[PDB]
Every structure is written in structure tokens, then in C-alpha cells.
Design a protein around this ligand. Structure first.
Ligand SMILES: NC(=O)c1ccc[n+]([C@@H]2O[C@H](COP(=O)([O-])OP(=O)(O)OC[C@H]3O[C@@H](n4cnc5c(N)ncnc54)[C@H](O)[C@@H]3O)[C@@H](O)[C@H]2O)c1
Ligand SMILES: NC(=O)c1ccc[n+]([C@@H]2O[C@H](COP(=O)([O-])OP(=O)(O)OC[C@H]3O[C@@H](n4cnc5c(N)ncnc54)[C@H](O)[C@@H]3O)[C@@H](O)[C@H]2O)c1
Ligand SMILES: NC(=O)c1ccc[n+]([C@@H]2O[C@H](COP(=O)([O-])OP(=O)(O)OC[C@H]3O[C@@H](n4cnc5c(N)ncnc54)[C@H](O)[C@@H]3O)[C@@H](O)[C@H]2O)c1
Ligand SMILES: NC(=O)c1ccc[n+]([C@@H]2O[C@H](COP(=O)([O-])OP(=O)(O)OC[C@H]3O[C@@H](n4cnc5c(N)ncnc54)[C@H](O)[C@@H]3O)[C@@H](O)[C@H]2O)c1
Ligand SMILES: Nc1ncnc2c1ncn2[C@@H]1O[C@H](CO)[C@@H](O)[C@H]1O
Ligand SMILES: Nc1ncnc2c1ncn2[C@@H]1O[C@H](CO)[C@@H](O)[C@H]1O
Ligand SMILES: Nc1ncnc2c1ncn2[C@@H]1O[C@H](CO)[C@@H](O)[C@H]1O
Ligand SMILES: Nc1ncnc2c1ncn2[C@@H]1O[C@H](CO)[C@@H](O)[C@H]1O
Lengths: 428, 430, 430, 428
């Protein structure tokens, strides 16, 4: 099996989108500009498990430009973009993903990505840690072969920390999420644009005048709240951390609990990465045609199982859009069956912010393969100078003119002018 | 002989019907209208030909006119703005509709003409958007004019035309400026666009707004929404304008305000909203950055010089329907959206149904006003009473769960004002 | 006999003069007016009595009327709104002014009366704010009316009164509604308040806005600015309103909109802007949170029941000038600002001079219009032409370095429009 | 000398302001509620060097409620609020500060605060580190007596890091600035309100329609930019860090250099904590009546010395407001003589956000005196649980209803429900 996709006839349209995407991802293009003739990743066979989209396609191709075999699966069962999976398949790269996978077909795709023509994998590129947990639970014999792993998302690094703690994480990993460039842009500015896209494409509902409830006010919650506020929704935040909770209050958001908010929320958006956020007792109290969705990583935040078993009727409006009628006569509109809505009902984050995440990922793959010394078995961060490098590579596109310290100023501040300008603990 | 309708695919009726049901729940203005008039059937004996974007929202409007006892026949007012499943639902209901997404300039005029004659005779009411149907009748069917009781016009361009026609003594039918109803011009035009513009752009291009420079030509009600929407997603918005007052507003709101001659060198994204010709020209295109996105959301596609692109470009690649990517002799590329047609309906579903409920409630009211009170309206261009305007707004407060304050008799008397009638003078600008 | 003036302290003249010089640099509208008319002296032979907040901005306005050849005598229109050093500068220039910060209701009426008679005879022009001077003359000096050529009225309350007077047939002098000039109502009322409200509150209390719940009564132009300003600093704004249209706007903008009966239990901060009586009552006060701040920014102090506080409170402690801290029987405390008078001028310097330049340019123009074109204006309530309105805006574009677009002859002809005359129809609401 | 103030007759008015302030500073009131009968600080003699204002008055009194002698000076020469310094003097607490100090009178005030009735000081409470650097340079014999120090502001902790690095910091210190509760509220939300207050009171200029230039886009720059944006200024950011620079670009701010910005800026606000930000060549290019000011800690960011020597004329408008005329005929309005404008031309930050900083400061003083073991000679942070405690103590006032994890959810997330909910590196 050379690959698996929904349609290879879409590869042509796919190639167009990539050419456009490339122009929006300077960070990744510098890497090609800089490491083409060098091929640092020479020898590496990188098994990837990220959302197979136009943005990821460009990432994959960049990894190859640096000289490395790559096999790919999708980490979510509806995130994949058919034409993007096609253009990568047509380029001679084993990709196993499509938009509409079942749970068995999802697990089946990750398996094809483990063995290459010249032996098993030696690098993981994961998000959420499905490919990490799989190789640790099903194929522990392949763990000594793997040299490094790089994790994209917040749930998958929290899981990589829980593994190192329980002494089961046998391979060294780099936390790419906690790069400032990822967490404080991707999670923040990314969802701020793609949440509403997902919701709009699915429902075409008016945001203005509505009351929107956002569970969680971390980086993702912040972006979602800001977005809905932008279109003149009234936003209500729920939260368990007093610091995050206070941040939201100081921004003019009412902060209460779901038990209260469910009685006035028109729109619901879980962003906690936690279970049991919206339950049946919430559903029973919601206004008619309340719109419920999730933008956390796993579909564990909404009790969809309750809606199935307790709804009077379930009308499907179109793919990833269900309209339940309840025994109280009012209806609930659920999106993407609880799975993340921005990739399930839209095209995910725009290419530019992904260039920031994926530029981090290239460096995270280079470091783990070019300097296997620095990184023992643990959970490490990328050095700030490299984190700043990613930011610097995107300034050009945005036409940003950056100031440079005089020698006198550098001496006053006691820092090297090229040198990272912030201490490690700096929170931006 | 004569077709019953013509649409993309009648199969999409079942799907459209679901959309209609959902939309109905978002459009209290039209539903109250139904609950209030379905028995009295005020529009009985009216034969209304409509030229308006055949969308899900318009479907709900059409079925409301029918419930009010009218006979309706519809065509879209833009070749790209029809939503096929919405047309299927209406067609399957038994309503003569002539609209599909992707019409030729030829087919578009054909579609309108299929509406002009009903089984019970010719049209006697006009529900127009942009003035296309108004102009068509006044020009190719002037003999039909005396049998038309009135016109209601939806958008700014259309009513401008009407006023011009009135000033040149060529308008022969009395008309109602529905656009300049407060519940239309200050909500539909402003808030509607504020949400639908971004959506049009996203669907078409999937581009990051944050960090982009955006150029909005025009700062009327439409431009205000667009600027607001763009800046919300982290773009630095630049504005162009000919009205010094509008210009002052934009500056006071923190927007840089300059000329297109200047902005074309800065913009990553360009949005025309002026309703005027020749806003973006070849000289502008030649200075734009690589992969600049260019789109219009004014009523007619006369604001961007597309024919220049076609003639002077060295490459033209269709990325997908209504998304073309040109390359110019300088090697930099220009993304055009919907062949210069309005991008919110061209590349997306237009305004959300809730704000359209305001637009369309005003429409229904104007149709009742013209049909049943002809004597109120002599040949001219008229506004709805402020009372009916305020009534529209009041109809949408419930769904948003707004709680309105009531004047005490003292408060009212102090203000010299009815507790229940225009809380504002005519010239009030909200 | 008759004093030349009366002000707090003539010593503050030197200081005020500096402020005047700075202000002049921020008010191009008035300066262009000077450069344009100082030689022609259009207002020669005019004897203008003014009742308007004696601030730095007004000083600049006064000296502009003098440069235009007029004889001016001034009193403030609010007992708390005068800025002493601004009054000193005017007094020292030789202009009869009667104003100081901290006037009694008695002294305030006295101050106005000192303006009614000039050395060269009685007043023949009125420049009023709120209608106090208009009503005074029509009531206690009706014999003076026939020798008055016209009136210009600055604020919403004042023009409402004028229209009422016109509808009851008791207005005997022709007047110009300056408030409903676009360059006033959409800038002064909106943007002016957006900056000066917060400043009034800060100076008075130095309280954190972020994290507070704020209740704004009224969502007209003034309320819109206040809501905007408060939400900007991280307050959750709640709105009350009687006009369903205004209410819809507020909701569409993301504000919760309910009744004062409800809000009084939530608010940390309360801001009245309705221009109506009895907005906040004892029943409201009794439910407010501890140390709730309460203030008004409408024209008259009739919106808050201060006398209730005085009579029913168990404690009253003056914290500092125009800041009183009550305690109620429930043990919770209420902070009142400026005895319920408008808080932006009461506890701060009012609007910044730049936006006031728009208000005051319209004023100067109205005075020239009434003085030199009486025949244009018969007894009634009139608007300035849109042309002059647009001219005001154009005068302030330069300082902000705005670059305005010019129509091509084709573009204009397409739009059926002068390149240089009202770019909008009358009913346009901007 | 029992104290030194501008007027003790203002103590009455001062007491009123405190009673009001107290109601806005719940965080500090809980500390009194909790440690009055306990007097943990019993034995401590705390020499303070913070801005002597209404907010600080409440802090001082809280420290005393916990049973500790306190002497106080002001760290800036125009920040002090007379009536607040009066109410503390009248309460029997040696305070040496007033609004209008000279440089010699400033140094003179810090000296009185060193020796108490029962011996020299044993605790520092500094900001900027003037009292820290003084005792290290002038009175090193008193260093062994001092048990702990707590630093408030960003410049004073960067200086405390430079001292520990050069092995000259002989006493253990707690970094209070880098508490999330301080840096991500005080610096951020505080200046967002008090910058414009300072500018308004000084000039009464219209913000709308103006172009404002903000040097720096850290926590302070972020607040200042957001504020000016709020009133419809067009804001331009200058910056040396690509990450901070990119953040500003993704928020819709034009990011260029001062060399460009000076030619269109109507208003100028330095927030870098760095020298030589605005020089004569910038001044020469500025528009007429450009308004220049600074909200960084030291008055080193603006070249006022240049304006004095090169201006044609210098008209004083009122205190802390100069209007220079230049040889090009255009004028510059300088505020507070370059010193920080929010405390020099207004009343500083509102009491509520200060309650967050000062609640941190109490815990920082308790920890250094109650548990002298945990903190050796270095630069330490407060533990996240205490940082979250500060946030929690303010939720009540704001009417925030916080969610609590179920046992099931806590187990899913693998965290204690009371337990800090974020990893150390979390950036909020
Ligand atoms: N859809 C996307 O494209 C996308 C992008 C980035 C991250 N994510 C996912 O989003 C989720 C969160 O990402 P984050 O970076 O926002 O994490 P984060 O930890 O910054 O914020 C999560 C917030 O949820 C709060 N929370 C936890 N349980 C809660 C509860 N029961 N009620 C209310 N609030 C609660 C936490 O206090 C925290 O502040 C993760 O699953 C992450 O993988 C998705
Ligand atoms: N796509 C939609 O859904 C939608 C919705 C509402 C209105 N519209 C259309 O949008 C257009 C404008 O709507 P509006 O309601 O904003 O009308 P409007 O007249 O308020 O806006 C016109 C603005 O354009 C400015 N303008 C005119 N010529 C200009 C030029 N050459 N350069 C710069 N600015 C110029 C005018 O001065 C004015 O400020 C009309 O064609 C109207 O039909 C479209
Ligand atoms: N302080 C200042 O510098 C300043 C500046 C401009 C105007 N004003 C004064 O402010 C007041 C309003 O100015 P505006 O221009 O906003 O006029 P406006 O008439 O647009 O605002 C009136 C708003 O108040 C609403 N309203 C009336 N009674 C109400 C009630 N009982 N409860 C709630 N809402 C109610 C009206 O429906 C309307 O929305 C007037 O007194 C005007 O003179 C003061
Ligand atoms: N006035 C107040 O009440 C108050 C409150 C908090 C902090 N501060 C002071 O403000 C200053 C900064 O505080 P911060 O917390 O904002 O620090 P911060 O480090 O978060 O942000 C400072 C920014 O300045 C940038 N910078 C440095 N040199 C620059 C240059 N030459 N040009 C442009 N940008 C440059 C840095 O990159 C950094 O992002 C310090 O002096 C601090 O003490 C004052
Ligand atoms: N368009 C996209 N392509 C690939 N990954 C994406 C896209 N949009 C969001 N993500 C990533 O999905 C993860 C959520 O599982 C986040 O780490 C986020 O960076
Ligand atoms: N979804 C929609 N259905 C019908 N008309 C619409 C829709 N969205 C915008 N419009 C109308 O399109 C016109 C622009 O040509 C405006 O008058 C506006 O009201
Ligand atoms: N600084 C000021 N000088 C004079 N009038 C002002 C000032 N600020 C606000 N006003 C006016 O006060 C009136 C409210 O009574 C409004 O008409 C407004 O224009
Ligand atoms: N009103 C105030 N009282 C005391 N300290 C303040 C006040 N406003 C700001 N600060 C502090 O001043 C420091 C700047 O030198 C910052 O650490 C900030 O927390």
C-alpha cells in the first residue's frame, strides 16, 4: 500500500492551494532556503500523525526538502482535507488519511505509517500523542529505534508529561506547544479566526445579539472569546483557575459556571481539554436551537452520548451538523459530533499561523536528529533563541521593521543584541 | 410555452427545507407577520414579481408573502448569489422561481422576464433590489407600468437610481425607500456585512487576516461594518473616502485615511464598498503586493477593473469557483474574488438570517402599505413611518431577550412624547 | 451700577492664556474662521449674549466671535462647569464674563442677567446651551424679543425645548438647531463623551474600571460613547433604553440590555445619559452594591434623585469638592458625583478642545447665518445646510493629516453628484 | 525626626481616601482578616521604598496589622501623594516623602528609613532597587542584619538578577514582579487606565484622531497601546524583540522604528525601561505640539537634556508640563520632565490592581521572615499556589463565580482540585 486517500483526482486542485499556502508560510520557506543543499534530516524516517491539511502538506514537503522519508496519518477523523491529502499522495509520499474516517479506519491509518521501505520509523511527529501512546502500548519493540519525538498540541504534551512522570515515556521528546511562537499565536490567534469560520459554515447563524458561553479561558478560550466579542456577541466565561478567571473579568467578561450560563447561552464552545463540561442537565435548560460545539482536542467535553439516548428525534441537516429535538420540545444544534469544529466544519487555522507552529516543528525535528546529545529521555523545550528565530522569519511578510539596540543600549540592559531579549520565565 | 420554474437541482429541496425551518427560528420579524396576517390575508390579489438574491432568507420572505395571500414569482438579482437548495425548496412548494448559482448575463435577464407575467395576468407589485427590475419594466415594458401599484427597493444603489429617475421625471410608479429604513440601513448594511464579508473571504481563500494590511474603500454603513470586522481579526485597516464627514469618522475611530493611489502599495487585502465606478484600476493593481486579495461588496461589479486584469495579465488560473489568480508582467500575483461581484453572497451565504429579518420585515410592510394604501403613496420615493420602523425593531427584541424600559406618564409628559409612538424626531440619525 | 465681569480669580489669567494658546492649536475649525473673516468682520454690530460652559474651549470660541467683529457677553450654563483660569483670561482680555466654579442657583441666574444688556443697548443675538437663556428672555424679558435676530442652540435638551416651544406657538425668535448638525451630534456627543466621562470619574474617584459592572441608562449618541469608553477599560456594560431601535443597536453590539429595576442589583457604576427625569430612584439606591458610584452626564441634574439621598441617608460625608459619600440604613454606601450635575465638566475639563472645535465652528457659522441672512430664517427651528456641515469636517481633516479622495468627472456623473457639494442626501444618517 | 511630609493637615482627607481604598483592596483585607491575631511579622522592621500613595498607605497599614515596625520613603520624586503621606504620618509611622522632592532630598529620605528606634532594618521592600543598591553600596555593614527583600517592578528585579550574577547580591530576595498576579495585571491593566489619566490631566488633549507611538510592547506597552486604541488613536509600536513585535502585528498595530514613527506621532510614550529611546533627531522631526512622555521606571528613555540645551524657549504651563519651542518653530510638550507620567501627572494605578501587587508583597514579606529556611541567597519566585491565592482573594469583589472540578475531572486531568492548575512554565 503506497498510500490511502479519498480522491487522487483532487491532487491538481490540491497543488494550487499549496502554491498559495507556500506564499503565506515564509517561516517554512526560509527552512527550505537554508537546508536544501544541507539535508540535515538525511537518514530520518519521520512518521507523522497530524491533521492532513493544506498547511500540513507544506510542512511534509519541507521535511522532505531537508531530505527525509515521511509517512502520514491524520489525528482526527474529520479534520483531513481531501485535496491536500491528494497532492501529497501524488508527490510520492505515503499518506493515509481522509475526511470521514471511522474509529477503526483511524487506527488503521496510523499503522501504515509505522513501517517504511527501509525499516521501521525513527522519528515521531505527533499531536495529542496518539502515535506516541500507540507505539508505547502496541509496539514497544520499536521504541529503542526511535531517536526523538515532537509534540504539537496542549493535550498531547500534558500527556507526555504524565508519561515521563509515570516513568513510561522511554523516548526523548521536545515540547513544541510551549514554544511562545506556538502557544501564544496558534492557540490564540489561530482559533480566533477559525472558530467562527467553523460555526458559520455549519450554521450560518448571526453572532451579533447572541449570548455565547466559552468554557475555559486559556490561550484557546481567549481567542474564541475575543472573536465572538468582535461580532457583538455577549460572552460568558467558565473557568477553574482563579488567575485565568480574573483575566477574563478584567476584560469585561461575565464569569460564572456552566450551571448558570446554560440558561442563557445561545452558543456554546468548550475549550477546556477536560471531560464532562456540558451534560444533559445543561442541555435540558438551553434555549431553543442553542448551538453547541467544541474546539478542544478530544471530543470528551460534550455529552453527545446523552443527546443520542435522550433526544426525541435527531435530524441531520448536513454533514457534521445535527439538530436534536428534546422531550421539552426545544432543539439543540450540535456540530462535528463534538469533535473539534474549526477543522471539522472549516479548514482549520490559516496557513500563516501554522507556519509558526510548523517552523518550530522543523527545528524540533532537526534538533532531535542533528544533536541527539543535548536531549536525553525527558520533556524538553526549544531554546528561546530558536523560538525568537521563528518569530523573526515571519516579520518580513508582515512588513514589520524591527528596532536594533545600539551597543550603548545593549550594555545598559546587559544583553547581547542578537541574544534572546527576555528571561526564560518571561510570559509575553 | 412557459416553464413553472427553473433551478439548479430540485433534489436539493429536502435539504433546503431543513435550512428554511432553522432560518424561520432566526427570523421572528417575518414569523410575527405570518401569525398576524395569515387569516386576514392583506396581500390577496397582489401579483408580486421579485428580483432579489434567492437565498434561504429570501425563501422565508417569499413564503411570508404567500401566507399573506399574494401570488409571487421570483428571480435572483445577481448571477452568483442564488443558493440552489433554497431555490429547490421554493420551487417544490409550487412557487415560480427562476434562479441558480452561476447564471450568464443572458440567462439572468431571461430569469427576470419569466416573472413579469402570472397566470392571473401581469405583475401589479414590484419587490426589487438594485433597480434592475424597475429599470427593465420602465424601459422594455412601459405599457405594463399603469397596472403596477407600487415598488419597494431594498438597497442603497437601487434607491439612488429611484431618486435620479424621480428628478428626471421618468419614474411612473410610486416607490418605498426600504433601504433608508433605520432597521435596514443601520443593521443589515452595518452588522450584516460585518459578519458576512469575512466569511466570503475565508471560504474563498482561507487566509490569515491577523497581521494583514486591509484597504476598505468607502466608509458609509457598509464600509463601517467591514472595517470593524477586519480590524477585529487583527488587520490594520486603511480607509479611502470622498465625503469629509465619513472621513472624519474613520479617523476619529483610529483608521488611517488616505487615497487608493497611496494604499495600493500597502494593502494585502482590498475591499470596495463605495457603490461607485472605477475604484480600483490597472495603475493600482500594478503596485500591489504579491498575492493581494481583491474583492467588492458594493451592489454592482463596476468598482473593480476586471476587464483590465483579463486583458493585461500574463497568467490567469482558476483556483476554484469564483476564485481567480492572475499574474501581472511584474511577476506578482493578484487574487480576485467572484469576478468582482459582491463577495459576501458570491463566495458565501450572505448576511445571517436574523438581520435579514429586519430588512425583510420592512419589505413585507412596504408591500402591505403599497397594496392596501395606494392613496397614501403618490408617484415619488417614500419612507416608511417611524412607527413601523420602531415596530420592526421591537419584533426582534424578544428573541434576543432584551427587556425594554417603559416611560412613566410623568417621564413621557416631561419629554413631551407618547409612551407608544416615535421616541425620536424624523431627522434623528441613531 | 454694573460690574465689568465677575470671576473666581483674575490672577489665573496668565495661566489661562497659555491654555488658550495650546487649545488654539487644537481647534483649526475656529482658527480658519478667524483667518477667513477677521478682515470682513461679518458679525459687526452683533451683540451676542452667550450661556455656555465657560471653559478653555469656549474662550477660544468667544475670542473668535470678537475677531469677527461681534460684541460678546458670557455666562456659564452650569454652576460647576466653569474653569476659573479660562474665565480670567477672557475677563483680562476685556470681555464681560460672569462665571466661576461653584455658583449658587441664585448667583447662576444673576450671572446670566448681567449679559442681557450691553453698553450699545440690549442683546440682539443668543448663543444658548440647554435653553436657559432662551427661556429666561421669553419669560422675564419678552419685551426684548423683537430686538433679537436669532438663536443658536448647542445641545439635545435645548433643541427639544425649542421644538416644543415651536409646537405650542410660544417661540418668537428664529433658531438654528446646531446640535443636530452632523459634525456636532455624531462627534461631540459621541466621541467627546467617550473620552471625558472616564476622565470625570477618574479625577473624582480614582477607581479601577476593569472588572466593574457598569450601567448606562440611555443609548443615544451620548450613551453610545460612554458604553464604548467603559467597555474599553474592561467593564461589563449593561444598558437600559425606551427606544426599541436604540435597544436593538446595543444588543447587536454585545451589551446586555435590561431595566434599571434589574440593573441596580448588578451595577458598580451608574451613568445616566437619557436627558429625562427620574432615571435613578430610592428604590434603586436601596439595592445597589457597597460603594456604587453614581453620576449623570445628561444636561440637567433631573435624572438622579439626590434629594432622596439627602433626606433618607443616615450619613453624608464630603470626600472632596463634588464628591459625596452617603450611607443608607442598610449600611451600604453610595458615592455621588457632582451633586448629580453632569460629571464630565463637573469633575473634569469636559470634552477635549479638538472635538469642541466642530461644535463651535457650527456655532460661529449659525451666528453668521442668523446675523447676516435673517431673511433665510423665519421664526422656527432650522438646520444648517449640509454644505456648511461638510465644510466643518473638511476644516479638521488637515490637522489629522487625512487625505480625502476626489471624484473624477465620470465618477461624479455616474453618481449624479457635484464634485463639491453634498455627497449625501438629507436623510442620510452617517 | 519622627517623619517628613508636605502637610499633616491633609491627614483627615487622607483617612477618607484610605477607607475608600480599603473597600477596593479585598486581597489586602483578607490578610488583615487572617493574620491580625497571629502577627507573623512580629519582630520585623520593614524599611520600604515605594511610591507613597493612597494605595501604599493601605499596604503599610496591613504590614502593621501583622505586627511590624515600618519606615517609608518614596522611590520617585513626584509620585508621592501628599494627603496619603499625611494619613500614614498621623498614624504614627515614620514616612519621609512628598510631591516635589529634589534629587538630594530624595536620597535624604531613604536614609531616615534605615535606622529604627530598636536598631537598623531587617527587611527591605523595594521597587527599582534604590534601597537595595544603597544598602549594598553605602551601608554594607547592615546587609548581614537584613533577612529578606521583596522587589516590585521589572527594572528592579532585572537589576536584582544582575547583582546575583555579579555575586554582589549578598541577601536573599523574592521576585514579586514575576508573579503572574503582578506582571499580568498591574503592568498590563494598571497602565491601561492610568497612562491616559496622566496624559489627560496634564494636557486635556483629544486622543481620537491622533497617531500615538508606543516604544516597547511588553506588559506595559501592551496596556498603553490597548488604551490609546480604545479612544481611537492610531497606534504605532516600536520594539526590539521579534516575538513581542509579532504579537503587536497580529493585533493590527503598525510596527516600525522610532526613526520612522517620529515623523507622524502626535503622542509619544516610552515603555522600554531602556535608554536613548527618543533623541534630538526624533524631536526635530516631530509634528507641532507633539506630546512626549514616559511610563517606564527611570527617566532615562527621553533625552530631556537635549530639549533644555537646544530649545529656543521653554514655557512652563503648570507643574510637570513643559512646552518647548524649537529652532524649527514647532513645539514639543514634555510631561513630568521625563519621569513616569501616570504617577507624576495622575494618581497612579487604581487601588484594586495594586491590591494584587501588594497582596503578593505581604506574602513575600511573610515568607522571607516566617520561613527564612526555604530561601537562600538568590532570586526566587513565589510558589504558584500562593500566586493563585492572590487571584482567588479578588474574585469575590468582582462577583466571579468560579467552577470547581469534580473528582472525576481532577483524575482525568491528573491534578489536585485545590492544587495549582497550571505548570510552572504556563504563560497565561
Ligand atoms: N482546535 C484547535 O485547532 C486547537 C488549537 C490549540 C489547542 N487546542 C486544544 O484546545 C484544548 C485547550 O487548549 P489551551 O491551550 O486552551 O489549554 P489551556 O490550558 O491554555 O486553557 C485551558 C483552560 O481550561 C480551563 N479548564 C479546565 N477544566 C475546566 C472546566 N471544567 N471548566 C472551565 N474551565 C476549565 C483551564 O483552567 C485552562 O485555563 C486542548 O485540548 C488543546 O489541545 C485546539
Ligand atoms: N453586499 C451586501 O450585502 C450589501 C449590503 C448593503 C449595501 N450594499 C451595497 O453597498 C454599497 C454601499 O452601501 P452603503 O449603504 O455603504 O451606502 P453609503 O452610500 O453609506 O456608502 C457610500 C460611501 O462610499 C463613499 N464613496 C463614494 N465614492 C467613493 C470613492 N470614489 N472613493 C471612496 N469612497 C467613496 C461615499 O462617500 C460614502 O461614504 C451600495 O452599492 C449598496 O447597495 C451591499
Ligand atoms: N455632558 C456633555 O458633555 C453632553 C454632551 C452631549 C449631550 N449631552 C446631554 O446628554 C443628553 C442626551 O444626549 P443624546 O445626544 O445622547 O440625546 P439622545 O436623545 O440621542 O439620547 C437619548 C436616549 O435616551 C433614551 N432614553 C430616554 N428616556 C429613557 C429612560 N427613561 N430610560 C432609558 N433610556 C431612556 C432615548 O430613548 C434615547 O435613546 C441630553 O441631555 C444632552 O443635552 C451632554
Ligand atoms: N509606570 C508604572 O506604573 C509602571 C508599571 C509597571 C512597570 N513599569 C516600568 O515600565 C518599564 C517596562 O516594564 P515592562 O514590564 O513593560 O517590561 P517588559 O520587558 O515586559 O517590556 C519592555 C519592552 O521594551 C522592549 N524594548 C527594550 N528596548 C527597546 C527599544 N530600544 N525600542 C523598543 N522596544 C524596546 C523590550 O523588548 C520589551 O518587550 C520598566 O521600567 C518597569 O519598571 C512602570
Ligand atoms: N489547519 C491546520 N493544519 C494543521 N494543524 C492545525 C490546523 N489548525 C489547527 N491545527 C492544530 O491542531 C491542534 C489541535 O489538535 C493544535 O495544536 C493546532 O496547532
Ligand atoms: N442572505 C441574504 N439574502 C438576501 N439578501 C441579502 C442577503 N445578504 C445580503 N443581502 C442584501 O444584498 C443587498 C446588496 O446587493 C443588500 O441590500 C442586502 O440587504
Ligand atoms: N469643554 C467643553 N466646553 C464647552 N462645552 C462643552 C465642553 N464639553 C462638553 N460641552 C457641551 O456640554 C453640553 C452638555 O450640556 C453639550 O452640548 C457639549 O457640547
Ligand atoms: N498607585 C500606585 N501606588 C503604588 N505603586 C504603584 C502605583 N501605580 C503603579 N505602581 C507601581 O509603580 C512601579 C513602577 O515604578 C510598578 O511596579 C507599579 O506596580
Amino acid at each position: 500500500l503506497p498510500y490511502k486517500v479519498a480522491d487522487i483526482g483532487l491532487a491538481a486542485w490540491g497543488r494550487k492551494a499549496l502554491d498559495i499556502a507556500e506564499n503565506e508560510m515564509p517561516g517554512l520557506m526560509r527552512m527550505r532556503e537554508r537546508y536544501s543543499a544541507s539535508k540535515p534530516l538525511k537518514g530520518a524516517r519521520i512518521a507523522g500523525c497530524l491533521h492532513m491539511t493544506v498547511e500540513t502538506a507544506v510542512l511534509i514537503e519541507t521535511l522532505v526538502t531537508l531530505g527525509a522519508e515521511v509517512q502520514w496519518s491524520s489525528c482526527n477523523i474529520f479534520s483531513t482535507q481531501n485535496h491536500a491529502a491528494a497532492a501529497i499522495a501524488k508527490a510520492g509520499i505515503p499518506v493515509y488519511a481522509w475526511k470521514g474516517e471511522t474509529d477503526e479506519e483511524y487506527l488503521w491509518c496510523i499503522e501504515q505509517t509505522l513501517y517504511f521501505k527501509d525499516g521501521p520509523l525513527n522519528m515521531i511527529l505527533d499531536d495529542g500523542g496518539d502515535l506516541t501512546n500507540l507505539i508505547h502500548t502496541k509496539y514497544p519493540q520499536l521504541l529503542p529505534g526511535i531517536r526523538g519525538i515532537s509534540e504539537e498540541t496542549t493535550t498531547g504534551v500534558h500527556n507526555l508529561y504524565k508519561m515521563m512522570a509515570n516513568g513510561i515515556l522511554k523516548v526523548p521528546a521536545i515540547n513544541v506547544n510551549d514554544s511562545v511562537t506556538k502557544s501564544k499565536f496558534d492557540n490564540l490567534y489561530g482559533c480566533r479566526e477559525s472558530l467562527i469560520d467553523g460555526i458559520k459554515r455549519a450554521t450560518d447563524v448571526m453572532i451579533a445579539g447572541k449570548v455565547a458561553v466559552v468554557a475555559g479561558y486559556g490561550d484557546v478560550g481567549k481567542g474564541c472569546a475575543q472573536a465572538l466579542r468582535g461580532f457583538g456577541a455577549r460572552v460568558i466565561i467558565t473557568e477553574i483557575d482563579p488567575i485565568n478567571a480574573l483575566q477574563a473579568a478584567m476584560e469585561g467578561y461575565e464569569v460564572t459556571t456552566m450551571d448558570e450560563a446554560c440558561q442563557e447561552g445561545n452558543i456554546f464552545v468548550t475549550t477546556t481539554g477536560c471531560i464532562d463540561i456540558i451534560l444533559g442537565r445543561h442541555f435540558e435548560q438551553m434555549k431553543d436551537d442553542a448551538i453547541v460545539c467544541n474546539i478542544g482536542h478530544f471530543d470528551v467535553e460534550i455529552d453527545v452520548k446523552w443527546l443520542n439516548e435522550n433526544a426525541v428525534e435527531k435530524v441531520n441537516i448536513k454533514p457534521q451538523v445535527d439538530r436534536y429535538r428534546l422531550k421539552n420540545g426545544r432543539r439543540i444544534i450540535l456540530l462535528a459530533e463534538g469533535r473539534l469544529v474549526n477543522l471539522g466544519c472549516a479548514m482549520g487555522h490559516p496557513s500563516f499561523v501554522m507556519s509558526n507552529s510548523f517552523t518550530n516543528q522543523v527545528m524540533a525535528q532537526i534538533e532531535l536528529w542533528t544533536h541527539p546529545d543535548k536531549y536525553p529521555v525527558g520533556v524538553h523545550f526549544l531554546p528561546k533563541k530558536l523560538d525568537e528565530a521563528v518569530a523573526c522569519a515571519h516579520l518580513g511578510k508582515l512588513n514589520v521593521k524591527l528596532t536594533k539596540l545600539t551597543e550603548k543600549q545593549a550594555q545598559y540592559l546587559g544583553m547581547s543584541c542578537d541574544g534572546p531579549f527576555k528571561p526564560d520565565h518571561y510570559r509575553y
